[PDB]
RNA sequence: GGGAAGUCGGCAUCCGUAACUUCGGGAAAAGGGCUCUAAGGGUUGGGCACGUUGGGCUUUGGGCGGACGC
């Protein structure tokens, strides 16, 4: 999987955990998006430098859910690594049209049996990773409206987590 | 009964009632579950057609044997 990345000439995207977050200076790299804010507050800076290297425009953007975890903006401000809001794309969201293209995954989940149990094991794994977030003042499991992550992750049926609804 | 009135000098404590506790196993949700880091039992298993090569289904011929028996 690593070799086919670095040798590919067509536009490519890796889907990775923190494996490629520190050190690897892959060439011709331009874009990073952070689907989940780092659980450790010291790998964001390293992750940004994965897109950068020398002169090249480093498209480093991170998502943030609405709520108190907007404060990740000024958490890094006092990290002395200021982060500004996105301006360059400025194409934000299509709202329901973003929901029904996320729906385009859900019937694919219906079509494919194996992708069914892959879904929650992805969900519970994310549930475990959030519960252990080091900063227990900006990230919290309490104010976590669940039924839109199932919509966000295209989950067919929210499993038997401790929280019941 | 009196009270020095004689003489110098008399003296695992036990039962009932109300809360509390031992042994073993065990970090990292609860009772489908995080990153990285090393081992995570072995053995065997890559499709479909063509003209193509080989022996593999009829046909043709040859050779060695030409035999056995009379
Ligand atoms: Mg380095």
Resolution (A): 2.7
Name the DSSP letter for residue A69.
Answer: G
Instruction: Look at the block and give the residue holding tokens 């952070």.
Output: A34
Beta carbons within 8 Å of A159's beta carbon, 6+ residues apart: A120, A123, A124
Helices (H) and strands (E) counted in chain A, each on its own, are 6, 2
Instruction: Look at the block and give the residue holding tokens 């080091």.
Output: A134
Distance CA A94, CA A37 (A): 23
Question: How far is the centre of ligand 1, averaged over its atoms, from the C-alpha of A23 (Å)?
Answer: 4
Q: B1 C1' – A137 CA distance, angstroms?
A: 95
Distance CA A44, CA A42 (A): 6
Nucleotide nearest to A124 (CA to C1'): B33
Degrees to nearest 5, angle at CA A78 with A87 and A49:
55
* Phi, psi torsion values for A62, nearest 5 degrees: -130, 140
CA A165 → CA A9, A44, A100, A158, distances in Å?
47, 34, 23, 9
List the structure tokens of A30: 């331009």
Which residues have their alpha-adjacent CB atom under 5 A from ion ligand 1?
A: A 23
Tell me which residues have their CB below 7 A from strand B: A 17-19, 39, 117, 120-121, 124-125, 127-129, 131-132, 159-162
Degrees to nearest 5, angle at CA A68 with A62 and A73:
40
Beta carbons within 8 Å of A103's beta carbon, 6+ residues apart: A154
Q: H/E element holding A122?
A: helix A114-131
Question: How far is the centre of ligand 1, averaged over its atoms, from the C-alpha of A25 (Å)?
Answer: 8
Listed as ranges, the nucleotides of chain B within 7 A of a protein C-beta are 28-30, 32-37
Question: How far is the centre of ligand 1, averaged over its atoms, from the C-alpha of A82 (Å)?
Answer: 22
Whether the Cβ atoms of residue A98 and residue A154 lie closer than 8 Å to each other? no
| Method in brief | cryo-EM
Instruction: Look at the block and give the residue holding tokens 């900063």.
Output: A135
List the structure tokens of A99: 């929901």
């Amino acid at each position: 999987n690593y070799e086919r990345f670095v040798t590919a000439t067509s536009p490519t995207v890796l889907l990775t955990t923190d494996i490629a977050a520190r050190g690897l200076d892959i060439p011709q790299v331009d874009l990073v998006i952070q689907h989940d804010p780092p659980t450790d507050t010291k790998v964001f800076i390293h992750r940004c430098g994965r897109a950068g290297r020398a002169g090249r425009r480093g498209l480093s953007v991170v998502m943030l859910q609405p709520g108190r975890e907007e404060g990740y903006v000024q958490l890094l401000e006092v990290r002395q690594t200021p982060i500004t809001p996105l301006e360059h794309p400025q194409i934000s969201v299509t709202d329901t049209q973003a929901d029904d293209v996320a729906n385009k995954i859900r019937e694919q989940a219906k079509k494919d049996r194996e992708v069914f149990q892959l879904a929650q094991r992805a969900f519970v794994s994310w549930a475990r990773s959030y519960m252990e977030h080091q900063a227990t003042s900006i990230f919290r499991v309490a104010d976590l409206d669940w039924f839109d992550l199932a919509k966000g992750y295209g989950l067919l049926e929210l499993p038997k987590m401790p929280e019941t609804r």
